[PDB]
Amino acid sequence: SYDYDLIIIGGGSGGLAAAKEAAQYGKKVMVLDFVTPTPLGTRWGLGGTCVNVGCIPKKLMHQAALLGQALQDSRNYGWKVEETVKHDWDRMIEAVQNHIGSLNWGYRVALREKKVVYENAYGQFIGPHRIKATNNKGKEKIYSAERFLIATGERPRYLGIPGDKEYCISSDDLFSLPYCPGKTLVVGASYVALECAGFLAGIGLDVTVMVRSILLRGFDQDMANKIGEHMEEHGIKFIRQFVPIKVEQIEAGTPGRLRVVAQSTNSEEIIEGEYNTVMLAIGRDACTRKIGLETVGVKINEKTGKIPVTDEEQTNVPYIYAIGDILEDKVELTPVAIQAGRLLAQRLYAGSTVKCDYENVPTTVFTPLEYGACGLSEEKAVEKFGEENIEVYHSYFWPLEWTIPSRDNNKCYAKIICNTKDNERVVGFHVLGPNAGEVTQGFAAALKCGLTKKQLDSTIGIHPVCAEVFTTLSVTKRSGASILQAGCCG
Amino acid sequence: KSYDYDLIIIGGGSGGLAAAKEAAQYGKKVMVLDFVTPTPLGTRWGLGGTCVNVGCIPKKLMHQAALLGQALQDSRNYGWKVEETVKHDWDRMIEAVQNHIGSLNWGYRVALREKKVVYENAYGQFIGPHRIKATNNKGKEKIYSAERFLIATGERPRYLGIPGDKEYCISSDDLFSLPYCPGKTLVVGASYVALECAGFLAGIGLDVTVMVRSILLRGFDQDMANKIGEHMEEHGIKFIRQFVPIKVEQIEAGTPGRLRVVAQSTNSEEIIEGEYNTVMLAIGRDACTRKIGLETVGVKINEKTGKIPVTDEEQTNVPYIYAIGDILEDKVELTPVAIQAGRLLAQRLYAGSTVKCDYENVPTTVFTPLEYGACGLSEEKAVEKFGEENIEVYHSYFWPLEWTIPSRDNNKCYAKIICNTKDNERVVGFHVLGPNAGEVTQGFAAALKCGLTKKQLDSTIGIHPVCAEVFTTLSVTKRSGASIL
Ligand SMILES: Cc1cc2nc3c(=O)[nH]c(=O)nc-3n(C[C@H](O)[C@H](O)[C@H](O)COP(=O)(O)OP(=O)(O)OC[C@H]3O[C@@H](n4cnc5c(N)ncnc54)[C@H](O)[C@@H]3O)c2cc1C
Ligand SMILES: Cc1cc2nc3c(=O)[nH]c(=O)nc-3n(C[C@H](O)[C@H](O)[C@H](O)COP(=O)(O)OP(=O)(O)OC[C@H]3O[C@@H](n4cnc5c(N)ncnc54)[C@H](O)[C@@H]3O)c2cc1C
């Protein structure tokens, strides 16, 4: 009957996921993926945001920044290393890209092998069960399928001020930028902002951060402030309550010099500075407005852009589904989108009845001092249950590996939120410290089995591991006791 | 009725000091005895216990130096302009290590002081009911009495019983303070301690060799163990299987000297010889329960092994004497567990608590060049408890994103979980071999305290890009028999 059994628009995380999973159950599948260039004209291969301008690139650069310190710790452990080592940006970028490349080509083969058709083209709906695929050279083509998957994902959002698109770079441009961005400026307080401000500073670049309001909106604010405080204390510069209003090229080059003017958010004050680069990280917009959603009947939320869907990842149009960052009121993370896409393909062609659960999803913001969390924030939690039925156990901690180099003591920190009405159930987990991601995974798994404080205490901790601090948490926030060492060094 | 103290603790160690403090917190008169008998080579250390002085701490820390070496090589491909090979100054490391333990020593001291607990740097020995004889360092003695006692003496490195050992060989106790690059080293044994040390020693450059009687990590998942060895073998360390030394002769003394080690195979009667700069023994530890006067008071210990039997309340056969820690019979020989037992006892005793310390499913990690943490049943011991037909094994390989750029050891790391099919595919065993293994495990161990199941695990979303996430999507089983390369 139709051309294909399933067509996937967007070769992204949840894209390629459902693709392979659907292909696995002998269906005819076609994935179309096309990457519209960035204002400065940046392009990249198959894979998605995570692979080319997200997780992968982000985390790796974070690595180079962490290795930086490791070089500086290595000294006290006895390694004869120079007081200050230098860093070659062009060598780094290159390496990073070389890997993304392999990831690209890998995914390609991955589709080939699973007998899935990949078309490097932009897709838009023209009418029921029909889609318009436009390639790079311009030549179009039409296809039809019994069902459709929207996995287009979003893109970096700009300010709408003089000079941005023209002189500023975004997360897309960065991971491939070909020059020491030199003194940089990061406009925004997002995880992306912070992690990037984060590794750049960690490579030695002079870094400044411009914040409209709060840090990490949506995250435990207490944890956030701490991240900031750590950020400030280790080099990063912060300007609070200031949005830029114009970016002016004082000279072009690799890099150039630029003047950024900004207007405070609470007064008439205006300030000016010149930096070598300016990256904007103030949000990202769903790529749902230019695909033909009218010509097929999809109701999205024209206001925000996200797509409302059902617990089966189904739109309002029974043969058109959407999974990923584009969904309305969900979780914008790769492993999530992949579970959705995988689970869908199963729900659909395998008789599965399992729905991708979006409750209590773990995360990790890769700031200089990582911070992973799972479950409710302190605030959100209190709000849901009421300050009297919620207790918070917290503590600081110092990583054994940090004693010898003798740095940052009483800087790492942990806390869990419990619901006294429900057997002191662990509703929220929060840790700030190294390798926080590794530390969090499993506790998330614990939440899926209803961990409780009694049960947590019953656990014995590993020693000496950062993660063990959760097994022995005796101090409550409400009791009001203090949390510090009777030595205070670091 | 009426005694000197309310509670006496023999042994100022992990569980010792733990119980000391928790009890003092409930207004009891406590006294802690801790004394360190020298090693044959004559080394001694401060308050604290094995962990702090010749164990966890020094061990991990040196592991760190070993790991930082790697970091120094990785840093290259990430953009840091460093030399092709950097040099490591042992003396300087040892020093750093020692300087931290001190603070730990003195910290505990103060810790007790402020908590109003009495501490005497003396050897304790029971002389009769509710009475103990504390001999100090210069030999002066003194007698104390208490309504209850706590044994927390823990073990010590065991020796072979062959010519040359106590006289030319070192143990874990001697190592972490050795005042000289051990040079070509030989580590006799295949215990975590053995491999761990052999591991970092090899990691800072030293020519390392390991001699094994039989298998590696007896007691551990043998599959996991092999992978640890095969990995150690792959990154420097040299092994010699089925051979125990029979004599160690001094070819010359020095800092360090040269020594000959003569060994006899176990499968034949062949005999080999080699000379190394030092020779460390990691063949076992023997509880210190033989010389404290346990006869004089009524304590029955298992004279065979050394451990002490006790109830599910860490109570001995004598109602007023309790024991916690490495010296217990059939339990768990790790620091956190001892600390829990001590803490929980004090509470069960003097605070009306009724909580028992659970020893089932205790997480642990071995800090070999390639960390390995595990929780619960091994595969073998697992099968053996439920039967090959009721146990399914999911496992995967994985490659840490941080390893990609430096381009190394791909398909070395490895995960694995054991489920009991007859019980909602419950997770009965967790095993991971990869970096930051401990961090990764901790939480899963807490998952087990809540009966995590494979359905539930699958319903968990992973963190990206984190090593840990590998356990959120395990599709392959060992029984199905597909591949993972
Ligand atoms: C800087 C940064 C760092 C991040 N770090 C992390 C992290 O560490 N961990 C984490 O879990 N998540 C991270 N994320 C989020 C993660 O990248 C996304 O959640 C994930 O990539 C979304 O998967 P997706 O398929 O829904 O969207 P995508 O991965 O972006 O897939 C979308 C693809 O579809 C293509 N496409 C769009 N429209 C069309 C069309 N009309 N026709 C054809 N093709 C089209 C696009 O070109 C794109 O390549 C990060 C994001 C950013 C920006
Ligand atoms: C190399 C090594 C590495 C280890 N690594 C780890 C690890 O990473 N994680 C982990 O959890 N565990 C580890 N352990 C085990 C851990 O050290 C023990 O489980 C823990 O120290 C036991 O606590 P304890 O109080 O029962 O024994 P101890 O800590 O040894 O306390 C015993 C103290 O009592 C003193 N004492 C003995 N007899 C007398 C006496 N008659 N009078 C007065 N004082 C006395 C001793 O001198 C000693 O200082 C390691 C052990 C070694 C050897």
* DSSP for A57-78, written as a single string: HHHHHHHHHHHHHHHHHTTTTT
Give the DSSP per-residue string, A362-392: -EEE-SSS-EEEEE--HHHHHHHH-TTSEEE
Going by DSSP bridges, is the β-strand pair B7-10/B149-151 parallel, antiparallel, or unpaired?
Answer: parallel
∠ CA A42-A48-A49 to the nearest 5 degrees? 65
How many CA atoms within 13 Å lie on the side-chain side of B347? 13
Would you tell me the crossing angle of helices B90-114 and B56-77 to the nearest 10 degrees? 140
Cβ atoms of A150 and A337 within 8 Å: the answer is no
- A-contacting residues in B 356-385 (Cβ below 8 Å): 358, 362-365, 373
Taking the C-alpha atoms of residue B21 and residue B29, their distance in angstroms, rounded to an integer, is 11
B152 CB near ligand 2 (under 6 Å): yes
Taking the C-alpha atoms of residue B25 and residue B350, their distance in angstroms, rounded to an integer, is 10
Protein residue closest via CA to atom 50 of ligand 1: A54
Going by DSSP bridges, is the β-strand pair A412-419/B170-171 parallel, antiparallel, or unpaired?
Answer: unpaired
Would you tell me the crossing angle of helices B437-448 and A436-447 to the nearest 10 degrees? 10
Cβ atoms of B45 and B181 within 8 Å: the answer is no
Cβ atoms of A432 and A227 within 8 Å: the answer is yes
Q: Please tell me the distance in Å from A203's CA to the nearest CA on chain B.
A: 9
Cβ atoms of A30 and A145 within 8 Å: the answer is yes
What is the SS3 assignment for B448? helix
CB contact under 8 Å between B96 and A76, yes or no, is yes
Active site (annotated) includes residue A463: yes
Cβ atoms of B6 and B148 within 8 Å: the answer is yes
How many CA atoms within 13 Å lie on the side-chain side of B75? 30
**For a pocket test of ligand 1, which of A20, A32, A33, A50 has the largest count of ligand atoms closer than 8 A to its C-beta?**
A50
Nearest CA in chain B to A455: B449
B55 CB near ligand 2 (under 6 Å): yes
Cα(A456) to centroid of ligand 2, in Å?
25
What is the SS3 assignment for B481? coil
Identify the residue among A80, A463, A475 best suited for mutation to test binding to B, counting B beta carbons within 10 A and taking the highest.
Answer: A463
Looking at the DSSP bridge assignments, the partners of residue A320 are A148
Taking the C-alpha atoms of residue B177 and residue B93, their distance in angstroms, rounded to an integer, is 10
Taking the C-alpha atoms of residue A332 and residue A274, their distance in angstroms, rounded to an integer, is 34
Report chain breaks in chain A, C–N > 2.5 Å, as residues after which they occur: none
Cβ atoms of A368 and A231 within 8 Å: the answer is yes
- CATH class as words, domain A157-282: alpha beta
The residue written with tokens 């969390």 in the block is A373
Q: Please tell me the distance in Å from B116's CA to the nearest CA on chain A.
A: 15
Q: Which two tokens stand for residue A183?
A: 């003194």
Taking the C-alpha atoms of residue B21 and residue B47, their distance in angstroms, rounded to an integer, is 14
Over its C-alpha atoms, chain A yields an Rg (Å, rounded) of 24
CB contact under 8 Å between A86 and B81, yes or no, is yes
CA-closest candidate to residue A114, choices A215, A16, A183, A180: A16
What is the SS3 assignment for A55? helix
Cβ atoms of A406 and A486 within 8 Å: the answer is no
Q: Enumerate the residues of chain B whose CB falls inside 8 A of the CB of residue A453.
A: none
Q: How far is CA B362 from CA A15, A237, A391, A437, B435, in A?
A: 40, 44, 27, 22, 20
Q: Taking the alpha carbons of A370, A407, A416, A453 in that order, is the dihedral positive or negative?
A: positive
Q: Please tell me the distance in Å from A98's CA to the nearest CA on chain B.
A: 9
Rounded to the nearest 10 degrees, how much is the dihedral formed by the CA atoms of A94, A95, A97, A103? 160
Written as one letter, the residue type at A159 is L
**A235: Cβ–Cβ under 8 A, 6 or more apart, which residues?**
A201, A207
Protein residue closest via CA to atom 38 of ligand 1: A152
CB contact under 8 Å between B447 and A451, yes or no, is yes
Taking the C-alpha atoms of residue B260 and residue B251, their distance in angstroms, rounded to an integer, is 6
Choose the catalytic residue: A129, A230, A394, A463: A463
Taking the C-alpha atoms of residue B104 and residue B98, their distance in angstroms, rounded to an integer, is 10
Q: Taking the alpha carbons of A299, A304, A305, A309 in that order, is the dihedral positive or negative?
A: negative
First-to-last CA distance in chain A? 71
Taking the C-alpha atoms of residue B479 and residue B393, their distance in angstroms, rounded to an integer, is 7
CATH number belonging to domain B158-283: 3.50.50.60
CA-closest candidate to residue B176, choices B13, B50, B70: B50
Q: Please tell me the distance in Å from B227's CA to the nearest CA on chain A.
A: 21
Taking the C-alpha atoms of residue A426 and residue A450, their distance in angstroms, rounded to an integer, is 7
Would you tell me the crossing angle of helices A55-73 and A191-201 to the nearest 10 degrees? 40
H-type alpha helices, A150-263: 164-167, 171-174, 191-201, 221-233
Q: Enumerate the residues of chain B whose CB falls inside 8 A of the CB of residue A462.
A: 336, 363-365, 373, 438, 441-442, 445
The architecture that CATH gives domain A2-156+283-359 is 3-Layer(bba) Sandwich (3.50)
Nearest CA in chain A to B92: A78
**B18: Cβ–Cβ under 8 A, 6 or more apart, which residues?**
B338, B339, B340, B342, B343
CB contact under 8 Å between B75 and A67, yes or no, is yes
A31 CB near ligand 1 (under 6 Å): no
Cβ atoms of B46 and B101 within 8 Å: the answer is yes
Cα(B102) to centroid of ligand 1, in Å?
51
Instruction: Write down the experimental method used for this entry.
Output: X-ray
Ranges of each domain in chain A: 2-156+283-359, 157-282, 360-474
Which residue in B363, B447, B471 is closest to A460 by CB distance?
B363
Taking the C-alpha atoms of residue A407 and residue A87, their distance in angstroms, rounded to an integer, is 22
Which residue in B358, B405, B472 is closest to A60 by CB distance?
B405
B193 CB near ligand 2 (under 6 Å): yes
CA-closest candidate to residue B378, choices B218, B187, B231: B218
Taking the C-alpha atoms of residue B235 and residue B202, their distance in angstroms, rounded to an integer, is 9
Going by DSSP bridges, is the β-strand pair B258-265/B271-276 parallel, antiparallel, or unpaired?
Answer: antiparallel
CB contact under 8 Å between B466 and A364, yes or no, is yes
Taking the C-alpha atoms of residue B464 and residue A482, their distance in angstroms, rounded to an integer, is 35
Q: How far is CA A180 from CA A89, A115, B166, B218, in A?
A: 6, 42, 59, 53
Domain B158-283 and domain B361-475 have a common topology: no
Q: Enumerate the residues of chain B whose CB falls inside 8 A of the CB of residue A459.
A: 363, 445-446, 449
Taking the C-alpha atoms of residue B19 and residue B12, their distance in angstroms, rounded to an integer, is 10
Q: How far is CA A322 from CA A147, A350, A447, in A?
A: 11, 19, 27
Exposure string of B178-197, with b = 16+ CB inside 10 Å and e = fewer, is: beebbbbbbbbbbbbbbbbb
Cα(A193) to centroid of ligand 1, in Å?
16
Taking the C-alpha atoms of residue A339 and residue A323, their distance in angstroms, rounded to an integer, is 9
CA-closest candidate to residue A42, choices A198, A145, A177: A177
Taking the C-alpha atoms of residue B332 and residue B289, their distance in angstroms, rounded to an integer, is 17
What is the SS3 assignment for B79? coil
- CATH class as words, domain B3-157+284-360: alpha beta
Taking the C-alpha atoms of residue A372 and residue A395, their distance in angstroms, rounded to an integer, is 15
Q: Where are the beta strands (DSSP E) in B305-413?
A: 321-323, 364-366, 372-376, 391-397
Cα(A50) to centroid of ligand 1, in Å?
5
Cβ atoms of B378 and B393 within 8 Å: the answer is no
Q: Which two tokens stand for residue B45?
A: 């250390």
CATH number belonging to domain A360-474: 3.30.390.30
Taking the C-alpha atoms of residue B265 and residue A348, their distance in angstroms, rounded to an integer, is 62
CA-closest candidate to residue B124, choices B106, B112, B141: B141
| A323 lies within 8 A of chain B by CB | no
Q: Compute how many other C-beta atoms are within 10 angstroms of the C-beta atom of residue A110.
A: 16
Taking the C-alpha atoms of residue B167 and residue B25, their distance in angstroms, rounded to an integer, is 45
The residue written with tokens 């043998």 in the block is B222
Identify the H or E element spanning B386.
helix B379-386
What is the SS3 assignment for B146? strand
- CATH class as words, domain B361-475: alpha beta
**B23: Cβ–Cβ under 8 A, 6 or more apart, which residues?**
B6, B7, B30, B117, B346, B349, B350
